[PDB]
Amino acid sequence: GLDFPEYDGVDRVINVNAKNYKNVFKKYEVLALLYHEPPEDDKASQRQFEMEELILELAAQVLEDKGVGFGLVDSEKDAAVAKKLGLTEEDSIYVFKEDEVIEYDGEFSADTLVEFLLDVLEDPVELIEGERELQAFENIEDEIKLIGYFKNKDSEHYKAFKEAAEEFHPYIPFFATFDSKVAKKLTLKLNEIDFYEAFMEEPVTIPDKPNSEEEIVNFVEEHRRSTLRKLKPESMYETWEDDMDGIHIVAFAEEADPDGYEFLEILKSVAQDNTDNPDLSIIWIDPDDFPLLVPYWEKTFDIDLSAPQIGVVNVTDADSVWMEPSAEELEDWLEDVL
Amino acid sequence: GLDFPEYDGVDRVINVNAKNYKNVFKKYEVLALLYHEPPEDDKASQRQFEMEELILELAAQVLEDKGVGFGLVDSEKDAAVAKKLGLTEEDSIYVFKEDEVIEYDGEFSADTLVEFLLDVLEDPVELIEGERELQAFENIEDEIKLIGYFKNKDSEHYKAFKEAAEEFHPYIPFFATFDSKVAKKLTLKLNEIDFYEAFMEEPVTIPDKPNSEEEIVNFVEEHRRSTLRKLKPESMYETWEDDMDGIHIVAFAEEADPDGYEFLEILKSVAQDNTDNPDLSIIWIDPDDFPLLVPYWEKTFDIDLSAPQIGVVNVTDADSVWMEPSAEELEDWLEDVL
């Protein structure tokens, strides 16, 4: 009776250094690097480091037959490897998929890291050919998505789109179609790129068609903050550090709970009415995606996370106010505390 | 700008031994113990142990303000503490909620462990009072659930039900109602206990009413294997080791995918037609609940886990056959290979 697969105890995470680094880069397809401060002499410090290495050791085993290497570049001792690579953010992971660098903005857990890298392994523009890929695109809602329509893979404007997708890969989905039947369904004229905001049904089309790469990348950096964003594990620190000037409006709702989902609907209707407003960002957190954190959110905030919640929290003091409702009722309580 | 909470590096996991153990049991409400083989002298062995302790160290920090202690009882060196406690299964976790023992049958990850213990912390019979708790019960489908109706909390038969719930806590949900309005909705006559099989709509009622504890526990051990079971992380090894005589029929379906869910519907209809059959167990795995494992399932089994799949796998050789469909088509292909 054969069982499931466990951690074997074998070390696979590499000590990338001055001797090393050139050869680790040519041995792997995509390579993941924890650029890090050395372990400070005390126990607490070394156990936090003990942990990070062992989470990367798990990701290593799992992603071994797929060509993802993992490495540690020490900030003081491999300082020259850091300089010559573009390793500037201190205890963070950096991913090298064929020369160009992806920064990892999320959760330090073997779970989200492996999903991130699997997404990294994929092609940056995902194609639409026939209605079963179109009604896949149509259903994405929790993220910004762009879609474009071109002549074929050779179109000068599609190479522009595809290079813009690379700069946002894997975090923002870029789709393309060369079928005029999908373009008819989707509105699209030739070389038109429509941008869809997270949780919006209505798209803004990128203006001076046909768009160059720089034009598409200016557009997307200019429209990254959606009105309703979702705290996602692979992004969690990118969305948290984009506070609307010291403040965050945070809504907890379990999308699975009947009551959580109903509140999610109201909240989606609040964002759709004030999306013309730029200062706003409502961050929605589904407690269910962050199990280890909901006892922290429950005693800090002094809320029951079994219920849908809506608050405003001071991004610095961790200080907050929570509401004790309709869209218009949710709006008004937001007017009175802000 | 304050950030999220990290592992502090502080040790909280206890070395439970002959001197220790009596006093660790009176210091904590619920206590979790990894009974374990010592680390074998080599590196591979000690790194696998290095890991388990550090996963329990995370669960420890998280569940610190809730009263769950964590411990290590060595099988050779704390052999007498193991004997006198009922610690017989080798590298496994055992949970002591006020004297009576719960065995942990699942995934060794900080993620599922914390959810398990939070569920452990709850009361074993969950009450139904008014239609918003009834349409909560009505929606549970992936597990066996029992519901009973009594006079009030004092009813001799309810203390029987509640003691049966304790023996299955936290894995099988036991519900009770004292409201005759819910009992009318649910069918129930007084002190009637209805058993609902996983993914079945129709309940078997426990026979010689009113049921004693032993009668309710005989019933449930006799009806644990549902026709359609779900590989759940908190249970994964309990459901895998209940092979239907060397074999398992395993279906992959992403419940979120439009196509995965449609296959889930067909599969639910196959189980509902052959549930009168006892040898059958179809295990359904949603790949999305096991991210670290789907590259293993994809190259072993040589299947695309993006698609719904249905196979038969030899529980020992890991050898398998997979189908290249309607309920009747799914039945027939199951008749030809078995």
Curated annotation (Swiss-Prot), chains A, B:
Pfam families given for it? Calsequestrin
**InterPro entries listed in its UniProt record:** Calsequestrin, Calsequestrin_C, Calsequestrin_CS, Calsequestrin_middle_dom, Calsequestrin_N, Thioredoxin-like_sf
Q: Does the keyword Calcium apply?
A: yes
PTM annotation, UniProt: N-glycosylated.
Entry superkingdom: Eukaryota
Q: How does it sit in the membrane?
A: Peripheral membrane protein
Q: Does the keyword Cell inner membrane apply?
A: no
Q: Which positions does the record annotate as the modified residue Phosphothreonine?
A: T88
Q: Which family does it belong to?
A: Belongs to the calsequestrin family.
How it assembles, according to the record, is: Monomer; increases in response to a depletion of intracellular calcium. Homodimer. Homotetramer and homopolymer. Can form linear homooligomers. Ca(2+) ions promote oligomerization. Interacts (via C-terminal end and preferentially with the monomeric form) with STIM1; this interaction increases in response to a depletion of intracellular calcium, decreases both STIM1 aggregation and clustering, interaction of STIM1 with ORAI1 and store-operated Ca(2+) entry (SOCE) activity. Interacts with ASPH and TRDN.
- Protein's name according to its UniProt entry: Calsequestrin-1
- Quote the gene name from the UniProt entry: CASQ1
